[PDB]
């Protein structure tokens, strides 16, 4: 049995476990992204976290959005990690609900491990579920899959069920991907550690491309909640 261990329902404001990131990181958050993240692009409305991507000059960027993380505040080793999210559609938009290993501080990326619960690019009727890590050879490895999501503008529960042997991905309880991590095979030992959660919406980058449909801005990513259950 899964029990609720943490949540953020965004009932009246952003809960105490979120840290806001700002700026463009290093080379556009490692992916040549175009937005400058700001605290100001995240708000709560009608019981939802609202991350807004805007066409706005700030800090030398042409776009602003928000990126939030639970690093140093809430981290999890295994669990059913889920979020109820509604996505905007527009060329250049790249929302994500994901996780990074706590040890990012000492081992860097991808050695810290990364669990992309949900990512989407542009107007795609597909979302992705992916892991990134450093295999036994010390190479940037990744394993991922996609699933058809025909109304991404609607709410959908994006989740992973993560345990010592596997990571399973779900959209609305439909399993669409699985990776075996049992006994740390192919350098996946890094997924037996604690991970924090991130939410963001990037504008442009290596994955969605550098064309942006600016007529779809301001664009809102809506997160009704983030919940973590553990057995
Ligand atoms: Ca809510
Ligand atoms: Cl668990």
């Amino acid at each position: 049995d899964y029990n609720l261990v943490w949540q953020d329902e965004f009932d009246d404001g952003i809960g105490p476990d979120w840290v806001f990131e700002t700026g463009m990181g290093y080379n556009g958050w490692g992916n040549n992204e175009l937005q400058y993240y700001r605290r100001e692009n995240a708000a709560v409305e009608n019981g939802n976290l609202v991350i807004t991507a805007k066409h706005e000059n700030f800090g030398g960027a042409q776009y602003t959005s928000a990126r939030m993380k639970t690093q140093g505040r809430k981290s999890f080793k295994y669990g059913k990690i889920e979020a109820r999210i509604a996505l905007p559609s527009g060329q250049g938009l790249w929302p994500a609900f994901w996780m990074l290993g706590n040890n990012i501080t000492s081992v860097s990326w991808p050695a810290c491990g990364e669990i992309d619960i949900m990512s989407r690019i542009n107007n795609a009727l597909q979302t992705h579920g992916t892991i990134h890590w450093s295999d036994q050879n010390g190479d940037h490895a990744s394993y991922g899959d996609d699933v058809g999501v025909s109304d991404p503008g609607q709410y959908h529960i994006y989740s992973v069920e993560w345990d010592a042997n596997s990571i399973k991905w779900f959209v609305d309880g439909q399993q669409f991907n699985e990776v075996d991590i049992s006994n740390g095979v192919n350098g996946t030992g890094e997924f037996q550690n604690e991970f924090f959660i991130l939410l963001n919406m990037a504008v442009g980058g290596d994955w969605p491309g550098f064309d942006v449909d600016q007529s779809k801005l301001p664009a809102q990513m809506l997160v009704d909640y983030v919940r973590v259950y553990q057995k």
Side-chain angles (χ1 to χ4, degrees):
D1 266 349
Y2 275 118
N3 278 263
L4 193 69
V5 292
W6 180 75
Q7 70 197 134
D8 191 339
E9 301 297 317
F10 306 109
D11 296 327
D12 261 357
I14 295 167
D17 302 315
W18 296 100
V19 175
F20 299 87
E21 286 175 298
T22 68
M24 294 188 80
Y26 176 58
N27 304 122
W29 295 93
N31 298 121
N32 300 131
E33 294 160 21
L34 309 174
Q35 79 298 323
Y36 184 112
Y37 287 134
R38 292 190 81 209
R39 166 58 181 95
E40 287 76 6
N41 291 60
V44 173
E45 300 175 22
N46 296 304
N48 295 258
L49 172 69
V50 183
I51 294 173
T52 310
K54 299 181 174 186
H55 179 209
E56 167 175 70
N57 289 349
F58 197 97
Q62 288 172 235
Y63 308 96
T64 56
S65 185
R67 174 163 159 157
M68 300 164 55
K69 62 183 180 183
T70 65
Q71 187 184 24
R73 302 211 185 169
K74 226 83 202 183
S75 57
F76 306 95
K77 180 190 179 176
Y78 315 136
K80 185 195 203 191
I81 301 127
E82 72 174 27
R84 180 160 190 262
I85 307 163
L87 297 172
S89 282
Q91 189 68 206
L93 294 174
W94 177 10
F97 167 44
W98 56 301
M99 308 184 77
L100 286 170
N102 282 354
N103 65 356
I104 196 167
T105 290
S106 55
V107 304
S108 190
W109 183 96
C112 60
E114 171 177 343
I115 308 169
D116 303 330
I117 302 170
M118 180 285 294
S119 61
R120 179 188 180 215
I121 55 163
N122 306 327
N123 295 305
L125 302 184
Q126 311 172 294
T127 58
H128 294 77
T130 327
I131 54 165
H132 302 262
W133 77 106
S134 182
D135 62 24
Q136 293 173 345
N137 309 321
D139 304 315
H140 292 45
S142 61
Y143 185 113
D145 205 355
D146 31 52
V147 56
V149 181
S150 68
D151 54 348
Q154 295 304 299
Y155 288 105
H156 298 273
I157 325 289
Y158 297 98
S159 65
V160 288
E161 279 171 4
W162 166 38
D163 65 40
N165 298 310
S166 72
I167 300 163
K168 293 178 179 182
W169 283 261
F170 304 77
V171 177
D172 297 328
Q174 169 190 324
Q175 184 168 328
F176 71 89
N177 196 26
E178 190 194 345
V179 292
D180 176 74
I181 62 173
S182 55
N183 299 109
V185 71
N186 300 323
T188 64
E190 286 293 309
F191 294 101
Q192 272 84 291
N193 294 310
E194 295 201 12
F195 286 53
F196 60 89
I197 294 164
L198 306 86
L199 282 164
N200 71 283
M201 191 159 52
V203 181
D206 294 333
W207 194 29
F210 303 94
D211 294 318
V212 178
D213 182 352
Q214 301 176 341
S215 72
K216 298 289 178 295
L217 307 170
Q220 292 179 329
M221 170 185 183
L222 305 186
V223 184
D224 187 17
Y225 56 71
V226 181
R227 291 175 186 163
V228 178
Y229 300 80
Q230 284 173 330
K231 52 169 182 288

